[PDB]
């Protein structure tokens, strides 16, 4: 029925008075950061030049207390250097890299990919994106007189859509990255529609309604003490270009302001919003009639999409093949259509920690539940355990071998593994005589733990392969220590974990 | 020295001849400082501090003065003085989970009681001292206790010379708690006959409760003064015959007189007058800026939920005081998001005695800032990146500083276990017991830093 209630634990916590502004100012991205500005203020850079910057960054703010640094590791030191806010007057810690004193932080961060290659990352402070929506940009005067000739959401929406180096790459690809240290306040779903056979414009923008219809419903659900008037709040539909081409895939991205006075904090509370946001429109009667003919699989929200450090393609930008322009779904009831057609240009619109658009109180949703286990794979985990049995989890097998001392108890066993590479493996026996075991993954049914003294690939004769002793519990509740070993060379998956051999504890 | 010192000073052995005070911040009262500093001067022949516990007596003639002192004491101190272990509290105290209210109770402190029975003692032995005019480092001792009431320069230096004597003799303890722990003895015997009731303390500072009716005031003021006559009289009397003669007359001070007083480990009690609404708390270290802050919370708490003593069953006070603690800690915590950025506020003091965390490579640059830390190290806990959590050497980086966000995911976690001890003492102690007071931060409030 919509699914919320039974299936969502909603968390959150008041917060009226400074501590609202004081908490909106902390978390979201500059009041000036998404405003247009003349020319773009920021660090843009390969990979390998912010690498620099940012050791010459560090040198100018160590020496003032920055405990020091010893493509992930540059994506989280430039979120935290862009995360770090202002004390008083003095100028922010960004600034020893944008080399402004006007740069005011929390500042998105943007992935740009080049030809042929290269991620150059680029923080700015401000940008000139009157200039990239300039081109999707309609006058007053042409909406109003689209408006008298059509006077129909659905028609005018239509029509409305058919009359639409780093530092230079930033304006062909710019993918803005996840912050988890400021606060979300657009809900933005990436929508990758699969197509069994083309799907006409008509028809999606009737199917867009709809979804418009299922999200709002989904969240007044979720967020309760909001106001979502199902024909008036402005959802905001970006269709990647290819009358539709696209025989494959239509790339759609759909942007929701989050309700007043709620704000959303979490990576794994917006991975919520998004699958109570998906069940909706897949429970709607509308959307999948009119989509399912069309439509492969009823999956259309990728919600991983929100993970510090995973960036998402903004729209009014092309992938290095299809430029994210806007598709009008206006909404039924809008006493607005001008500033509805004028606010997809505005970036706060389509930005997860822009700027909310005098708060007395403010609601954080900081947690919607933990990873969704299925209703089915809740009773479907409660009645296989009822059925075949228990098994043990990773900790507990371990803890009867005397280990509360995984990188100990690998030594022990290390002989094992070592003389079953002498019987299989001896052209490479003797490189595992002296070897220290250092732990490379933790978790609760997986363990894997290398072998530094490059040794050599035991698969093939391509200084080729890092080797990891991995440990589960298998068979009945047993454990199984497996030999695996990554190599580099193409003949191996490159950089992918392949075993070798698995024997008994 | 390695593990540096409390007291700054700077003495001058030799070249230029010229005393040179350091007189640590205090503007306020800069001429009130200068002057302790000149009278502790002149006094103690200028070896204080530096010259240490020898001031009075060298190092190894004390082991002949406490023996000689175990000597002249009556046959029973004789004892136990012999059977002093490390914190024996010999006497009927509360069980530190309980509370007590509202009835008549009342403070005790006699100012100096270490300094002034190792003066007594040290004369005792004074005859078993190899030389009579080796006795001089005798007469210092004596003039700070003399004049330790009429000017607080006396004060430091006692508050300093006698547990650091105490260090040089290790037999010295066994004597000074023996002799406190006969005088809390006679506190006890004494306390019976004038209605007082020993309830907790920590020898010469005690704290006790009346059997009067609780309703009062006008007789009250009169019981609460003859206890204290009575309590002194009969300490100075066992004193006496114990041989032990004190210099300054002894006196006991009034300091305070509450209603309400709630304890739950064996330093902290919180007490209350509701008459005057005057408190005060002990036993909640102030290792901070933000533990005060967190002090002021807790002393407000404990006001409104010990104003709570409108009729009810035992079971809904219990619920309506949980509530209003939690209520607190939420008011705590939003405030706390308001001084979030400044990293000094949210620093503690560790001692070259604590585990400490490992100094960064770059606080080794702080040039003329390194030579202030002499015995506090303050550290404050930022998180660079993500899940690492390192510290900060406060006060060795140039200022202003620049940090990443201080970790109050760490701070605030520590504050609100000091918060949460006082908390389940007082649930479990005036209404039934059961109820650790514990506060959701994890999940309810953890989004505001993390
Ligand atoms: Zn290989």
């Given at each position: 029925?919509?699914?919320?209630?039974?299936?969502?634990?909603?968390?959150?916590?008041?917060?009226?008075?400074?501590?609202?502004?004081?908490?909106?100012?902390?978390?979201?991205?500059?009041?000036?950061?998404?405003?247009?500005?003349?020319?773009?203020?920021?660090?843009?850079?390969?990979?390998?030049?912010?690498?620099?910057?940012?050791?010459?960054?560090?040198?100018?703010?160590?020496?003032?207390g920055?405990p020091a640094?010893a493509?992930?590791?540059?994506?989280?030191?430039?979120?935290?250097?862009?995360?770090?806010?202002?004390?008083?007057?003095?100028?922010?810690?960004?600034?020893?890299?944008?080399?402004?004193?006007?740069?005011?932080?929390?500042?998105?961060?943007?992935?740009?990919?080049?030809?042929?290659?290269?991620?150059?990352?680029?923080?700015?402070?401000?940008?000139?994106?009157?200039?990239?929506?300039?081109?999707?940009?309609?006058?007053?005067?042409?909406?109003?007189?689209?408006?008298?000739?059509?006077?129909?959401?659905?028609?005018?929406?239509?029509?409305?859509?058919?009359?639409?180096?780093?530092?230079?790459?930033?304006?062909?690809?710019?993918?803005?990255?996840?912050?988890?240290?400021?606060?979300?306040?657009?809900?933005?779903?990436?929508?990758?529609?699969?197509?069994?056979?083309?799907?006409?414009?008509?028809?999606?923008?009737?199917?867009?309604?709809?979804?418009?219809?299922?999200?709002?419903?989904?969240?007044?659900?979720?967020?309760?003490?909001?106001?979502?008037?199902?024909?008036?709040?402005?959802?905001?539909?970006?269709?990647?270009?290819?009358?539709?081409?696209?025989?494959?895939?239509?790339?759609?991205?759909?942007?929701?302001?989050?309700?007043?006075?709620?704000?959303?904090?979490?990576?794994?509370?917006?991975?919520?919003?998004?699958?109570?946001?998906?069940?909706?429109?897949?429970?709607?009667?509308?959307?999948?009639?009119?989509?399912?003919?069309?439509?492969?699989?009823?999956?259309?929200?990728?919600?991983?999409?929100?993970?510090?450090?995973?960036?998402?393609?903004?729209?009014?930008?092309?992938?290095?093949?299809?430029?994210?322009?806007?598709?009008?779904?206006?909404?039924?009831?809008?006493?607005?259509?001008?500033?509805?057609?004028?606010?997809?240009?505005?970036?706060?619109?389509?930005?997860?920690?822009?700027?909310?658009?005098?708060?007395?109180?403010?609601?954080?949703?900081?947690?919607?539940?933990?990873?969704?286990?299925?209703?089915?794979?809740?009773?479907?985990?409660?009645?296989?355990?009822?059925?075949?049995?228990?098994?043990?989890?990773?900790?507990?097998?371990?803890?009867?071998?005397?280990?509360?001392?995984?990188?100990?108890?690998?030594?022990?066993?290390?002989?094992?593994?070592?003389?079953?590479?002498?019987?299989?493996?001896?052209?490479?026996?003797?490189?595992?005589?002296?070897?220290?075991?250092?732990?490379?993954?933790?978790?609760?049914?997986?363990?894997?733990?290398?072998?530094?003294?490059?040794?050599?690939?035991?698969?093939?004769?391509?200084?080729?392969?890092?080797?990891?002793?991995?440990?589960?519990?298998?068979?009945?509740?047993?454990?199984?220590?497996?030999?695996?070993?990554?190599?580099?060379?193409?003949?191996?998956?490159?950089?992918?974990?392949?075993?070798?051999?698995?024997?008994?504890? | 020295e390695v593990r540096g010192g409390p007291?700054?000073?700077?003495?001058?052995?030799?070249?230029?001849?010229?005393?040179?005070?350091?007189?640590?911040?205090?503007?306020?009262?800069?001429?009130?400082?200068?002057?302790?500093?000149?009278?502790?001067?002149?006094?103690?022949?200028?070896?204080?501090?530096?010259?240490?516990?020898?001031?009075?007596?060298?190092?190894?003639?004390?082991?002949?003065?406490?023996?000689?002192?175990?000597?002249?004491?009556?046959?029973?101190?004789?004892?136990?003085?012999?059977?002093?272990?490390?914190?024996?509290?010999?006497?009927?105290?509360?069980?530190?989970?309980?509370?007590?209210?509202?009835?008549?109770?009342?403070?005790?402190?006699?100012?100096?009681?270490?300094?002034?029975?190792?003066?007594?003692?040290?004369?005792?032995?004074?005859?078993?001292?190899?030389?009579?005019?080796?006795?001089?480092?005798?007469?210092?001792?004596?003039?700070?206790?003399?004049?330790?009431?009429?000017?607080?320069?006396?004060?430091?230096?006692?508050?300093?010379?006698?547990?650091?004597?105490?260090?040089?003799?290790?037999?010295?303890?066994?004597?000074?708690?023996?002799?406190?722990?006969?005088?809390?003895?006679?506190?006890?015997?004494?306390?019976?006959?004038?209605?007082?009731?020993?309830?907790?303390?920590?020898?010469?500072?005690?704290?006790?409760?009346?059997?009067?009716?609780?309703?009062?005031?006008?007789?009250?003021?009169?019981?609460?003064?003859?206890?204290?006559?009575?309590?002194?009289?009969?300490?100075?009397?066992?004193?006496?015959?114990?041989?032990?003669?004190?210099?300054?007359?002894?006196?006991?001070?009034?300091?305070?007189?509450?209603?309400?007083?709630?304890?739950?480990?064996?330093?902290?009690?919180?007490?209350?007058?509701?008459?005057?609404?005057?408190?005060?708390?002990?036993?909640?270290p102030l290792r901070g800026p933000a533990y005060?802050?967190?002090?002021?919370?807790?002393?407000?708490?404990?006001?409104?939920?010990?104003?709570?003593?409108?009729?009810?069953?035992?079971?809904?006070?219990?619920?309506?005081?949980?509530?209003?603690?939690?209520?607190?800690?939420?008011?705590?915590?939003?405030?706390?998001?308001?001084?979030?950025?400044?990293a000094e506020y949210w620093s503690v003091r560790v001692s070259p005695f604590e585990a400490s965390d490992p100094l960064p490579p770059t606080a080794f640059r702080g040039?003329?800032l390194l030579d202030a830390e002499h015995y506090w190290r303050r550290v404050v806990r930022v998180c660079p990146?993500?899940?690492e959590s390192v510290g900060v050497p406060v006060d060795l980086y140039?200022?202003?500083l620049?940090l990443p966000?201080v970790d109050?995911?760490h701070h605030?976690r520590e504050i609100?276990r000091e918060?949460?001890?006082?908390?389940?003492?007082?649930?479990?102690?005036?209404?039934?017991?059961?109820?650790?007071?514990?506060?959701?931060?994890?999940?309810?409030?953890?989004?505001?830093?993390?």
């Amino acid at each position: 029925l919509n699914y919320v209630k039974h299936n969502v634990t909603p968390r959150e916590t008041v917060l009226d008075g400074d501590t609202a502004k004081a908490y909106l100012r902390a978390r979201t991205y500059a009041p000036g950061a998404l405003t247009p500005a003349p020319a773009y203020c920021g660090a843009v850079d390969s990979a390998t030049k912010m690498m620099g910057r940012l050791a010459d960054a560090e040198k100018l703010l160590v020496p003032r207390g920055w405990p020091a640094f010893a493509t992930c590791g540059i994506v989280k030191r430039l979120l935290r250097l862009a995360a770090t806010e202002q004390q008083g007057p003095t100028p922010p810690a960004i600034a020893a890299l944008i080399r402004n004193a006007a740069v005011q932080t929390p500042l998105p961060v943007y992935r740009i990919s080049m030809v042929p290659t290269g991620q150059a990352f680029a923080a700015l402070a401000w940008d000139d994106w009157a200039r990239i929506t300039r081109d999707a940009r309609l006058a007053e005067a042409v909406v109003s007189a689209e408006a008298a000739a059509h006077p129909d959401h659905g028609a005018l929406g239509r029509r409305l859509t058919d009359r639409i180096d780093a530092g230079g790459q930033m304006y062909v690809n710019r993918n803005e990255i996840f912050n988890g240290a400021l606060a979300i306040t657009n809900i933005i779903l990436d929508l990758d529609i699969a197509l069994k056979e083309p799907v006409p414009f008509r028809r999606l923008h009737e199917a867009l309604g709809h979804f418009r219809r299922g999200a709002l419903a989904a969240v007044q659900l979720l967020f309760p003490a909001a106001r979502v008037d199902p024909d008036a709040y402005p959802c905001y539909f970006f269709k990647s270009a290819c009358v539709c081409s696209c025989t494959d895939k239509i790339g759609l991205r759909v942007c929701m302001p989050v309700p007043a006075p709620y704000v959303v904090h979490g990576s794994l509370t917006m991975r919520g919003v998004a699958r109570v946001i998906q069940q909706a429109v897949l429970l709607d009667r509308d959307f999948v009639e009119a989509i399912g003919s069309y439509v492969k699989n009823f999956l259309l929200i990728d919600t991983g999409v929100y993970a510090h450090g995973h960036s998402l393609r903004l729209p009014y930008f092309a992938k290095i093949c299809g430029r994210l322009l806007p598709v009008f779904v206006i909404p039924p009831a809008c006493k607005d259509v001008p500033a509805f057609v004028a606010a997809h240009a505005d970036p706060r619109r389509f930005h997860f920690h822009a700027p909310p658009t005098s708060p007395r109180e403010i609601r954080v949703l900081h947690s919607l539940g933990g990873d969704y286990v299925s209703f089915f794979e809740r009773k479907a985990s409660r009645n296989a355990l009822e059925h075949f049995g228990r098994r043990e989890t990773l900790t507990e097998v371990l803890g009867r071998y005397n280990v509360q001392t995984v990188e100990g108890f690998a030594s022990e066993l290390l002989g094992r593994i070592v003389a079953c590479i002498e019987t299989h493996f001896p052209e490479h026996a003797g490189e595992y005589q002296a070897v220290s075991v250092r732990r490379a993954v933790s978790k609760d049914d997986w363990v894997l733990l290398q072998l530094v003294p490059s040794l050599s690939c035991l698969r093939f004769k391509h200084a080729t392969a890092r080797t990891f002793v991995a440990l589960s519990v298998g068979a009945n509740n047993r454990l199984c220590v497996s030999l695996c070993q990554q190599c580099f060379a193409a003949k191996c998956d490159s950089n992918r974990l392949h075993t070798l051999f698995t024997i008994d504890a | 020295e390695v593990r540096g010192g409390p007291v700054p000073y700077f003495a001058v052995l030799g070249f230029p001849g010229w005393p040179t005070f350091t007189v640590p911040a205090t503007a306020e009262s800069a001429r009130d400082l200068v002057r302790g500093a000149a009278a502790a001067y002149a006094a103690l022949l200028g070896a204080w501090p530096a010259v240490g516990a020898r001031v009075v007596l060298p190092p190894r003639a004390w082991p002949g003065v406490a023996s000689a002192a175990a000597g002249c004491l009556l046959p029973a101190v004789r004892e136990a003085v012999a059977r002093w272990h490390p914190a024996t509290k010999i006497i009927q105290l509360l069980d530190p989970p309980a509370a007590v209210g509202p009835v008549w109770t009342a403070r005790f402190c006699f100012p100096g009681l270490r300094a002034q029975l190792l003066a007594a003692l040290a004369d005792l032995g004074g005859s078993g001292l190899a030389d009579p005019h080796g006795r001089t480092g005798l007469a210092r001792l004596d003039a700070l206790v003399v004049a330790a009431p009429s000017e607080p320069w006396a004060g430091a230096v006692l508050e300093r010379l006698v547990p650091d004597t105490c260090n040089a003799c290790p037999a010295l303890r066994q004597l000074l708690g023996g002799v406190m722990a006969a005088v809390c003895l006679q506190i006890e015997e004494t306390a019976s006959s004038v209605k007082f009731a020993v309830c907790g303390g920590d020898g010469g500072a005690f704290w006790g409760v009346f059997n009067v009716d609780p309703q009062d005031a006008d007789a009250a003021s009169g019981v609460i003064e003859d206890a204290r006559r009575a309590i002194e009289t009969a300490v100075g009397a066992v004193l006496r015959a114990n041989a032990v003669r004190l210099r300054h007359p002894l006196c006991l001070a009034l300091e305070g007189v509450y209603t309400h007083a709630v304890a739950w480990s064996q330093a902290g009690v919180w007490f209350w007058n509701s008459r005057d609404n005057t408190d005060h708390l002990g036993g909640f270290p102030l290792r901070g800026p933000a533990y005060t802050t967190a002090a002021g919370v807790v002393r407000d708490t404990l006001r409104r939920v010990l104003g709570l003593t409108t009729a009810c069953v035992p079971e809904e006070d219990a619920l309506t005081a949980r509530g209003l603690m939690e209520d607190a800690c939420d008011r705590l915590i939003l405030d706390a998001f308001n001084k979030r950025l400044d990293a000094e506020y949210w620093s503690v003091r560790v001692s070259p005695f604590e585990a400490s965390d490992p100094l960064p490579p770059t606080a080794f640059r702080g040039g003329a800032l390194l030579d202030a830390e002499h015995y506090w190290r303050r550290v404050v806990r930022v998180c660079p990146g993500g899940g690492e959590s390192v510290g900060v050497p406060v006060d060795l980086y140039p200022r202003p500083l620049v940090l990443p966000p201080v970790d109050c995911a760490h701070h605030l976690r520590e504050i609100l276990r000091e918060i949460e001890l006082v908390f389940t003492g007082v649930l479990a102690g005036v209404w039934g017991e059961g109820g650790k007071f514990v506060y959701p931060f994890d999940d309810k409030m953890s989004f505001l830093f993390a």
